[PDB]
């Protein structure tokens, strides 16, 4: 993920196929765990763009109101992801309805920097620019523990 999200192959020395909605750079990617052919990428003009690879195209884009540092899918449900986001929040989106977030995790005092799922698909860790670590459950929407 650079100025254009390229798709490469280990055998070929050249970028095999580029994807880009427009000419807006891209600062974070993640392939999902189950149904592996779905990619998502954040974008520096505060956007989230889902791509599909088995039809080799970007598919949908939601422009938020603050830029989103880092996203992560969950391994036990395959169509929900979390975006750690600079308005001090994490968000829990579905993939089908991108008009509401299933949750918003709400306990940081500075910009959330990265988020990762538990492999049981139950809890979430967000580490932020504020010098601490929050752990949430995917049911509440408030912190469970601070490190």
């Amino acid at each position: 993920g650079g100025a254009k999200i390229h798709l490469w192959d280990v055998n070929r020395l050249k970028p095999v196929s580029d994807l880009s909605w427009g000419a807006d750079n891209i600062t974070s990617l993640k392939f999902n765990q189950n149904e592996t052919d779905i990619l998502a990428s954040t974008g520096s003009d505060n956007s989230i763009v889902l791509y599909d690879l088995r039809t080799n195209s970007p598919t949908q884009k939601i422009v938020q109101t603050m830029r989103t540092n880092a996203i992560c899918w969950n391994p036990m449900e395959a169509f929900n992801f979390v975006t750690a986001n600079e308005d001090h929040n994490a968000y829990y989106y579905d993939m089908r309805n991108l008009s509401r977030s299933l949750n918003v995790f709400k306990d940081h005092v500075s910009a959330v920097m990265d988020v990762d799922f538990s492999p049981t698909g139950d809890e979430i860790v967000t580490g932020s620019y504020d010098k601490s670590i929050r752990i949430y459950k995917t049911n509440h929407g408030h912190s469970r523990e601070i490190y």
């Binding site: 505060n46 939601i62 109101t65 509401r100 977030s101 299933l102 949750n103 918003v104």
Partner: peptide, 28 residues
């Protein structure tokens, strides 16, 4: 709360939706 008591048409916007400027493809 004060603006709701004096203004006519303010909509209640949910907290799971206060942060979406917009999508590309819309829904039914």
């Amino acid at each position: 709360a004060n603006e709701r008591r004096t203004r006519k048409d303010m909509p209640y916007i949910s907290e799971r939706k206060k942060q979406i400027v917009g999508t590309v493809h819309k829904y039914e």
